[PDB]
Every structure is written in C-alpha cells, then in structure tokens.
C-alpha cells in the first residue's frame, strides 16, 4: 500500500529492500501486527542500507516518511470495541469505603462492564508495615532534632533527610528478615513474614494484625476482588521481581500497581482506572450554567463535580469547598438541574473503539498520565510499555543493587548509587539518570518522583515513540504533538479532577511537606491524650 517495488526501482542490501517492500505490498492478511511487523522489517533494512552506503538515499528517505504514515493508517483502519472490563487495583491493605464508592459510580453507569478489583492475597499488611516504619522514623527524627525544631528558622528539609536515614535502616532490616524467612523449607506468606516482624520489632499485637488481615480479604472478596497471585497474572519472573521490589523493599504501592495494570490489560484487555477516577460528565450540560470568569478551567471542572455530589450524594461527604464560594442563584440553578433527573449526569462508556495494536492513555498538562488506560488483550503497544518498564528496571537495578547490598547507612549507600549513575555516565539518556537518582527517597521525601520514569508515564511516552518510529527501547526521545494525541483517552469519558485525585498516595510536594512537618512539631510539643 506504499509505492510498489518498480516505482522505487524506477525512482532510485538494496535488493532486500525491494523484496521487503514487495513482501509488504503483497502481504494482505488481516493481522494488523503482522502488517506492522513487516513494515518494521522493511524499515530496518532501509536503515542498514543507508548506513553502509551513506543516489539511492534520496528516495529511500521518502519511503521512510511514507512508512511512518502507513503505521498511522494501519492503526486507524480497523478499530473495534475494547473488551468490556474495568480493571481497578488496590494492594497493600483494606480497600477503603471511599474507593468503593468511586468504583460504584462506574459500575452503575456501565452495568455491562465486568469489574475486576485486583489485590494481593498475600500482602494486606504492607501499608501497616510502611506506617510503622515511617511513624517510628518520624519520632526518631523529631526527638533527635528536639533542640532545633523549636527554632522558627528551622529548615523542614533537615527533618525529612534525617528521617530518611532511619526509614532506610528499617526497610533494610525488614527485607533482610524477609530474605531469611522466604528461604525456609516451608515458604511462608508475605503477610506471615510482615506479621512476625511487626510483632517482634514494633510491638504489634498478633491478633489485631490477623483480624485486620482477614477483614481486608473478606471486604475485597465481596467487592469484585480478584487475586493477582492465584489468577496467573504474572508469567515472567522478571516482572514479578519488579512488582515485588516495589511492594516489599520500597513500600511503593503505586509503583506495584503500575506493573499490575499493564498485566491486567495484557491478559484481559479493557479499561484500567485508578480508584480516584470518575465517569465523565454528560457533555453540553454546563453550557446552560455558564461559568464565571473568576473560576479557572481546572477549578470549574472540580466545581462541576462538587455540584452533583451536593444534591445527589452518590459519594458521601464529598467536598463542597470550591462550590460553596459563590452566588446562590448559581447554587439554585445547579440544584434544579440535578434534582430534575444518573445517566443524564454521567456519560456511559459504551463502545470504546481501539486498534488491537494500541493503548490509549489519559492526558494531563499535554503529557500522558497512566491513571486511565484502554487496550485490547495482548496489544502490541501494551507489550512495548512492558518492555520499556523491564528495560528501565534493568538499568536501575544494575546501578542500585551494588549500593543497596553494601554494608552502609542511607547517606553512604545513596552516594554509591549516585556516583554509580554519574561518575562514568554518557550524555545520551543523561536525563533519565537524574530522574531515577532519588529512587530510594520515593514516597518518603518531597519531590522524589522516580516512579514516573520507571513504571509510569515516562515508560508510556517512550513506548509510543517506539511504536510510531518502529523502534524498541527508546529512552529519552519524545513524539511531537500530532503523533502523541493518536493515543488519547477520550476526555468525554473521564473526570480526572476529583477530590481524591488531589492527594497523591505515593508522593508529595514542598508545600505539603512543610505543612506536614509543622503538624508533626505541633503535635510533638503539644502532646496527645
């Protein structure tokens, strides 16, 4: 469906190109992946030619540009509705009533979608363990710095840095205890190991931990729960190890959920949603309620959502803070619309048409964000994201394991990792090293965001670059705008600006860190009853 072989012969190693075009030109199977794979072969052959024989190359480039358009054509040619699964993930403890209320909106609007709530049957005590490590480290740092936290000029960053040293120490003691327990002849469960470590090291009561563990299992089972361990979601040890290093070494449940969502789409297809997402609002609804010039676009999206919850109360105790601040005629006008009528409030997903080659993704501030995803089972692009994640973790673990296994505290371990990254690095993919350098701090210090570049949106953006340009394992190359929105999750189908979305459960910014520290100081000096 390109220029035929004679055209390129009449317009210009090279023999392989002609047949490679010829194979592609004749290839008339209905397998999109085979078509793409043949397109990919042709491109590499052209490239081989080009480098080794740096008159042909004028028109071979023209074919190269044509091939890029053919990829778009193949993708957009035969779209079909995605499997009607909604995949959610809650790992590490009891799923919250708030999360269940959010999932309930999706289910009520989309009764034909099968709801899966993925959980880890062995790992209900991970969030409890993280809490015990972090809170004990907070008390260490506050008491250590007692003389200086009373000073108004005190840099809250000093508290977070000192606390991190205790956090790193206690994460390492847990993983060493885990390593000895998992190597017994009878393999205990992850929650067996955490329970035993919490009881002996942190004076937790064994019966309350067990009663919490059984409670979490019963609640998730009654709420669409499906176990990632028992349903053969993981088929590669490498991917399970990545999931496990996030679940167990780092306590980063968002990173662990980054892995699980990719495997759920790969194996089943459908839609992935973070539990803080909400169905999109019925279009055209809030043009008749025109929006003031004092309220911004993002805010007005939030205010929209606060209006529905005020009168319908689908989610209990939803914030009305942004809504309340204005004219009562607006509130009354909002009040009549909602009371006049869910399906007129919220958009139904219905058929979400996708290529079986692609994955679609939510956008935020012009950049992809993997809090909402659409993919058919086994799609080529989902497999490219998974390969990106494994490649990124291969590089991370190559440089992190020597540091982490050395007999060193957090400060010296950090320097070995950091020096391993920078002292002998190349300028190519330089930017990736900077983003993963604070990896050990993720979840425990402000502005540590390495997860974005490992298992999150950065892996997706490079996968899209892989797909568009028929490459693999791209690191820091990014697509232009016109290529990127080829993979956009339909905005009409999604409300990203929810109350729960405002608070990240794996990271925090400087303003939140300062407020949290002052809260730690006020409670510390003020005491608790």
């Amino acid at each position: 469906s390109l220029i035929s072989k004679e055209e390129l012969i009449k317009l210009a190693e090279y023999k392989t190109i002609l047949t490679n075009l010829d194979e592609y030109n004749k290839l008339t199977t209905n397998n999109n992946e085979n078509k793409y794979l043949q397109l990919k072969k042709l491109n590499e052959s052209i490239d081989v030619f080009m480098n080794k024989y740096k008159s042909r190359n004028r028109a071979l480039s023209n074919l190269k540009k044509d091939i890029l358009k053919e990829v778009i054509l193949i993708k957009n040619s035969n779209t079909s509705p995605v499997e009607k699964n909604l995949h959610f993930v809650w790992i590490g403890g009891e799923v919250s009533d708030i999360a269940l209320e959010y999932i309930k909106q999706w289910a009520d609007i989309n009764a034909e979608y099968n709801i899966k709530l993925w959980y880890d049957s062995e790992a209900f005590l991970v969030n409890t363990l993280k809490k015990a490590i972090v809170e004990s480290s907070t008390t260490e740092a506050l008491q250590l710095l007692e003389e200086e936290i009373q000073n108004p000029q005190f840099d809250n960053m000093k508290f977070y840095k000192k606390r991190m040293e205790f956090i790193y120490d206690r994460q390492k003691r847990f993983i060493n205890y885990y390593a000895s327990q998992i190597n017994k002849p009878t393999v205990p469960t992850i929650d067996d190991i955490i329970k035993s470590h919490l009881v002996s090291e942190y004076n937790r009561d064994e019966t309350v931990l067990e009663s919490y563990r059984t409670n979490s299992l019963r609640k998730i089972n009654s709420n669409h729960g499906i176990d990632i361990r028992a349903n053969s979601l993981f088929t590669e040890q490498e991917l399970l190890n990545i999931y496990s290093q996030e679940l167990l070494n780092r306590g980063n449940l968002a990173a662990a959920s980054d892995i699980v969502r990719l495997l759920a789409l790969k194996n089943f297809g459908g839609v992935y949603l973070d539990v803080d997402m909400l169905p999109g609002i019925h279009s055209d609804l809030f043009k008749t309620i025109s929006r003031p010039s004092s309220i911004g676009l993002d805010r007005w999206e939030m205010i929209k959502l606060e209006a529905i919850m005020k009168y319908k109360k689908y989610i209990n105790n939803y914030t009305s803070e942004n809504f309340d601040k204005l004219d009562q005629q607006l509130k009354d006008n909002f009040k009549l619309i909602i009371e006049s009528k869910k399906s007129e409030i919220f958009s139904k997903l219905e058929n979400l048409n996708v290529s079986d080659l692609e994955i679609k993704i939510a956008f935020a501030l012009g950049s992809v964000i993997n809090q909402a995803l659409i993919s058919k089972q086994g799609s080529y692009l989902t497999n490219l994201v998974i390969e990106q994640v494994k490649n990124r973790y291969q590089f991370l673990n190559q440089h992190l394991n020597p540091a982490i296994e050395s007999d060193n505290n957090f400060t010296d371990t950090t320097k070995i990792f950091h020096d391993s990254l920078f002292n002998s690095a190349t300028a190519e993919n330089s930017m990736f090293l900077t983003k993963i350098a604070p990896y050990l701090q993720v979840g425990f210090m402000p502005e540590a965001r390495s997860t974005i570049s490992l298992s999150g949106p950065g892996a997706y953006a490079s996968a899209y670059y892989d797909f568009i340009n028929l490459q693999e394992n791209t690191i820091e190359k990014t697509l232009k705008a016109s290529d990127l929105i080829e993979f956009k999750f339909p905005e009409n189908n999604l409300s990203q600006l929810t109350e729960q979305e405002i608070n990240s459960l794996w990271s925090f910014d400087q303003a939140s860190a300062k407020y949290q520290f002052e809260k730690y100081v006020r409670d510390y000096t003020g005491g608790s009853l």
Partner: nanobody
Amino acid sequence: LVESGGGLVQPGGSLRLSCAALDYSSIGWFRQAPGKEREGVSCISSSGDSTKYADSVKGRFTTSRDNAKNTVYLQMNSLKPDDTAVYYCAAFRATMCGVFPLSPYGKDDWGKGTLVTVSS
C-alpha cells in the same frame, strides 16, 4: 526437603521423583535447567485433591501425596530433552504454591535437588 529418584531416562520413558520432608501445606515441584531460569512444574494441595501443572508438562506429569510417608511424588512420563534439569521441591503456606509456576521473590535455596537427564 530431600529430593530423590533422579537419573537418566530415555526420550519417551518414565521416572518417579520423591520429595521427603507437610500435612497442612501445599507442595510444589520446581526445576532449573543449566543456564535457564527456575520454573514451576507441579503443585498439589495439602489434602491432595487439587493439583496444578506448568503448561509444558500438563497431561504428561502428575503429582501425588502419600501423607503416611510424608512424601510427595512427581510421576514424570513421556520424558523429553527439554525436561533435562535439576528438580527441587518446596512446601508452601499459601494455597496452591502461591504465584506458581513462578518462584517467590528472593528465594534462592531449594535444597540439594535431584538431577534428571533425558538424552539421545
């Protein structure tokens, strides 16, 4: 856990490995070929009423439990060259050997194990 019964077999032949200690634990057989990653092979529940197998051996291998002599067997049949590996056994608190046929994260000692070679 002591693994016994390994040795040579000819392609198409049978062999029965034994794993000697387990009553209330699921038990799994695993294998590791030279230069390859370990992979699960079989698992059997504590009652012995449920079993699970790797795709590559399903319908060729079976596993059973003789509680009385605290020992789980691996009945291998239709042996192939690809079944050449060292075979190890492990017990599990989890139902059906957890993430089977994958291995627990960090678990790097499985005992001595017993070698099986199927050649020529």
